[PDB]
């Protein structure tokens, strides 16, 4: 259904480690979509795997997950086509917005945790990559998650900087899982709250950095400037220990979101 020649570059939405994304127009349909090119030097068998595994994204419908239209391969570059969210990613919003208010972070948290639990229950997958830039917003006030790990093979093929939102345990070994996403969210809401990457507490090299998050105490929210309920919420996400750390059920019925 989706083909390379059937598209038309409109503008460029942004870029990261391994992917470029364009605001594009799907001629046959008129739909404005976001198209993500991932450059992969890869053999036909696996190139087909990744595509085959991306089909699952047709079954990912939630108001908390970014819509998916199709995926295909075109000249050394794999394509994922998705809902264009005309507000961009929270990392952008933060840059232009200085710091994001506690009340809004509240709406954001609701969405992220609803999004995570949907991917867990209905599809049995962890997100693996939650952080401000993988949470998209749109003018209809929607707040959706993208770039979650639906395809093992694509994670593989992409085995290949500054900030990390990876959990202490994921940083330390392969002994991690869905609990790891919670830490990410924790860290992301702290970032967006204060307007700055919260490590170290208010220019740091890779080991300094990575060593801080695994050996030094977790970041906390500034005091007095944020409700005690926001504090406890973040605090329960950022607990070094995966088992002690809040799980998805517990955060759903936490005070902070209840207030939200
Ligand atoms: N569906 C979409 N709708 C609107 N904007 C998008 C969409 N997907 C990505 N973007 C924007 O384009 C950028 C592309 O992000 P991409 O996933 O390629 O790298 P990243 O996630 O920002 O960072 P990294 O890959 O380094 O983790 C994002 O920062 C976001 O601003
Ligand atoms: O984009 C990724 N990582 O981002 C890194 C910068 O390219 C991805 C990594 C692993 C996967 F399985 C992915 F599907 C995936 N991409 C998407 C997943 C869901 C939607 I809705 C849209 C996506 F684009
Ligand atoms: Mg992304």
CATH code of the domain covering residue 33: 3.30.200.20
Count of beta carbons in the 10 Å neighbourhood of residue 209: 16
89 is in an annotated binding site: yes
How crowded is the C-beta side of 176, counted as CA atoms within 13 Å? Answer: 21
Structural domain ending residue among the three candidates 64, 85, 106: 85
Judge residue 189's burial from the number of C-beta atoms within 10 Å of its C-beta, 0-12 exposed, 13-18 middle, 19 or more buried.
Answer: buried
DSSP annotation of 121 reads: H
222 and 175 inside one domain? yes
With CA atoms as reference, report the closest residue to 153 among 79, 51, 71, 18: 51
Torsion angle, alpha carbons of 186, 192, 198, 204, to 10: 120
144 and 210 inside one domain? yes
Which element (helix H / strand E) includes 20? strand 19-26
Residues 210 and 131: their CA atoms lie apart, in Å, by 16
Residue 19 vs residues 35, 62, 200, 209: alpha-carbon distances, Å: 10, 24, 28, 25
Residues 152 and 205: their CA atoms lie apart, in Å, by 30
Residues 72 and 238: their CA atoms lie apart, in Å, by 38
74 and 121 inside one domain? no
Beta strand residue intervals within 84-236, DSSP E: 88-89, 135-137, 143-145
Residues 255 and 260: their CA atoms lie apart, in Å, by 8
68 and 142 inside one domain? no
With CA atoms as reference, report the closest residue to 60 among 14, 127, 137: 127
With CA atoms as reference, report the closest residue to 134 among 121, 123, 126, 145: 145
DSSP annotation of 169 reads: H
Going from the Cα of 90 to the center of ligand 1, the distance in angstroms, rounded, reads 10
Residue 216 vs residues 35, 201, 203, 234: alpha-carbon distances, Å: 40, 11, 17, 17
Residues with Cβ within 8 Å of residue 163, at least 6 apart in sequence = 131, 197, 209
Residue nearest to atom 8 of ligand 2 (CA): 147
Residues 54 and 197: their CA atoms lie apart, in Å, by 32
Residue nearest to atom 24 of ligand 1 (CA): 16
Going from the Cα of 22 to the center of ligand 2, the distance in angstroms, rounded, reads 14
With CA atoms as reference, report the closest residue to 154 among 70, 80, 50: 50
Classify 1 as helix, strand or coil: coil
Structural domain ending residue among the three candidates 39, 57, 85: 85
Number of structural domains the chain divides into: 2
177 and 141 inside one domain? yes
Going from the Cα of 243 to the center of ligand 1, the distance in angstroms, rounded, reads 31
30 and 123 inside one domain? no
13 is in an annotated binding site: yes
Pocket test for ligand 1, best of 10, 11, 12, 13 (most atoms within 8 A of CB): 13
234 and 219 inside one domain? yes
Count of beta carbons in the 10 Å neighbourhood of residue 80: 27
Residue-level length of the chain: 260
Residues 27, 6 contacting (CB under 8 angstroms): yes
Atom of ligand 2 nearest to the CA of 149: 12
Rounded to 10°, the helix 228-237/102-123 angle is 40
Classify 36 as helix, strand or coil: strand
Residues 252 and 260: their CA atoms lie apart, in Å, by 11
Going from the Cα of 190 to the center of ligand 1, the distance in angstroms, rounded, reads 20
Pocket test for ligand 1, best of 10, 16, 32, 92 (most atoms within 8 A of CB): 16
Residues 142, 129 contacting (CB under 8 angstroms): no
Catalytic positions: 129
**Ligand lying closest to the C-alpha of residue 83:** 1
Residues within 6 Å of ligand 2 by CB: 16-19, 36, 38, 57, 66, 68, 80, 82, 129, 146-151, 154-155
10 and 126 inside one domain? no
**What resolution (Å)?**
2.7
For the Cβ of 192 lying below 6 angstroms from any atom of ligand 1, the answer is no
* Residue 78 domain boundaries: 1-85
95 is in an annotated binding site: no
Residues 99, 122 contacting (CB under 8 angstroms): no
**Ligand lying closest to the C-alpha of residue 139:** 1
Place of tokens 């409700």: 227
Which experiment gave this structure?
X-ray
Residues 256 and 258: their CA atoms lie apart, in Å, by 5
What the block records as the tokens of 49 is 């795997």
What the block records as the tokens of 52 is 């085959």
208 and 93 inside one domain? yes
240 and 113 inside one domain? yes
Residues 119, 107 contacting (CB under 8 angstroms): no
Torsion angle, alpha carbons of 75, 58, 32, 153, to 10: -30
* Cα radius of gyration (the chain): 19
């Amino acid at each position: 259904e989706l083909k390379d020649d059937d598209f038309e570059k409109i503008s460029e939405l942004g870029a990261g480690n391994g992917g470029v994304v364009f605001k594009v127009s799907h001629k046959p349909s008129g739909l404005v979509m976001a198209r993500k090119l991932i450059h992969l030097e890869i053999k036909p068998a696996i190139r087909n795997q990744i595509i085959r595994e991306l089909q699952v994204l047709h079954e990912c419908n939630s108001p908390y997950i970014v819509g998916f239209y199709g995926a295909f391969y075109s000249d050394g570059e794999i394509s994922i086509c998705m809902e264009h969210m005309d507000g961009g990613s929270l990392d952008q919003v933060l840059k232009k917005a200085g710091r994001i208010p506690e009340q809004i972070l509240g709406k954001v948290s609701i969405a992220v945790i609803k999004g995570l639990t949907y991917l867990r229950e209905k599809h049995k997958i962890m997100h693996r990559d939650v952080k401000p830039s993988n949470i998209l917003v749109n003018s209809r006030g929607e707040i959706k998650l993208c770039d979650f790990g639906v395809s093992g093979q694509l994670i593989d093929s992409m085995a290949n900087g500054t900030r990390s939102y990876m959990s202490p345990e994921r940083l330390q070994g392969t002994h991690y899982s869905v609990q790891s996403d919670i830490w990410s969210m924790g860290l992301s809401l702290v970032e967006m709250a204060v307007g700055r990457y919260p490590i170290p507490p208010p220019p740091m090299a890779i080991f300094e950095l990575l060593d801080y998050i695994v050996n030094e105490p977790p970041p906390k929210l500034p005091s007095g400037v944020f409700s005690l309920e926001f504090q406890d919420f973040v605090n329960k996400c950022l607990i070094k220990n995966p088992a002690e750390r809040a799980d998805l059920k517990q955060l759903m019925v936490h005070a902070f979101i209840k207030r939200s």
